[PDB]
Ligand binder design. Structure first.
Ligand SMILES: *CC(=O)N1CCN(c2ccc(Cl)c(Cl)c2)[C@H](C(=O)NCc2cccs2)C1
Length: 301
């Protein structure tokens, strides 16, 4: 029993974190086999923060301009290339701590763990979600660029996020490990703003199913709804639309508990209307939306 925001064990990722320095700029890099991945704006200068020409800046660098330190060890860079917004640095040494890994691009609503790092050293691990507006609500200070987000399923680390920047609202933007941004953001310091954010409805429903599984029933009601009528209500609360994929995806938790998906949607409609009147659900007085249907199945059963 019990229900916690649970991150993945971070040890496989810790063994991959290094420090990358170009010029006066230092940030974190990800050392997998003989390649170090890091945000390409490490090669920017103060003057070049608004409209960097990364192709121009990179053609002017030689390998010896890049200082890579794994612990006390300086790694020798033997090549450099750019892939979208990520720099790939070839090193003379393959990382002996390289886990089984893959790079994955995730979709909004997906969760992952973040290993926040500074100067190549881990500071902490926490659980995050890709918001519908393609930002993440992280905990990042300056120098944390290059920290990565990941899931571990079996013994394989799936890297899905690299941190590049903080926007003016204090939310964070980054890329997948192929260097493509999530969302419409760019690695420039020009004015950028996140779209309006919404609540991840399928994750809320998944968490209410987890609550029923942990014996919490006070928010259930005798009603059901249509998918269409529910979405008309939810949009009015800045909840995301619920699709039939979402309904299919909750199928298992619906089976496990006896409550149809559209019955639980009726309970969510009512909670949006009344709030919790002092009560809590699985320990929260707000509706939690950073647990996926998949997370709920692995922590409860
Ligand atoms: C994450 C980190 O370690 N930071 C280093 C500086 N930085 C950036 C440098 C260059 C560029 Cl092109 C970008 Cl987008 C970010 C990070 C950051 O969030 N900069 C602050 C910004 C000011 C205006 C827009 S982003 C922090």
């Amino acid at each position: 029993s019990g229900f916690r925001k649970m991150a993945f064990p971070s040890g496989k990722v810790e063994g991959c974190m290094v420090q990358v320095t170009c010029g006066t700029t230092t940030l974190n890099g990800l050392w997998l086999d003989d390649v170090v991945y890091c945000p390409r704006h490490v090669i920017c200068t103060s003057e070049d923060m608004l409209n960097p020409n990364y192709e121009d800046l990179l053609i002017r660098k030689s390998n010896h301009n890049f200082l890579v330190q794994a612990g006390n060890v300086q790694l020798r860079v033997i090549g450099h290339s750019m892939q979208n917004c990520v720099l790939k640095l070839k090193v003379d040494t393959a990382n002996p701590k390289t886990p089984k890994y893959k790079f994955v691009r995730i979709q909004p609503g997906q969760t992952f763990s973040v290993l926040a790092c500074y100067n190549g050293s881990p500071s902490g691990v926490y659980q995050c979600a890709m918001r519908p507006n393609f930002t993440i609500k992280g905990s990042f200070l300056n120098g944390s660029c290059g920290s990565v987000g990941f899931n571990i399923d079996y013994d394989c680390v799936s890297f899905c996020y690299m941190h590049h920047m903080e926007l003016p609202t204090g939310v964070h933007a980054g890329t997948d490990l192929e260097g493509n941004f999530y969302g419409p953001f760019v690695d420039r310091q020009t004015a950028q703003a996140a779209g309006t954010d919404t609540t991840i409805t399928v994750n809320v429903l998944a968490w209410l199913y987890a609550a029923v599984i942990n014996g919490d029933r006070w928010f259930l009601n005798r009603f059901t709804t249509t998918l269409n009528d529910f979405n008309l209500v939810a949009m009015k609360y800045n909840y995301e639309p619920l699709t039939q994929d979402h309904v299919d995806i909750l199928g298992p938790l619906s089976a496990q508990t006896g409550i149809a998906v559209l019955d639980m949607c009726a309970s969510l409609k009512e909670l949006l209307q009344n709030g919790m009147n002092g009560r809590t659900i699985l320990g929260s007085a707000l509706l939690e939306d950073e647990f996926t249907p998949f997370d709920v199945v692995r922590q409860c059963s």
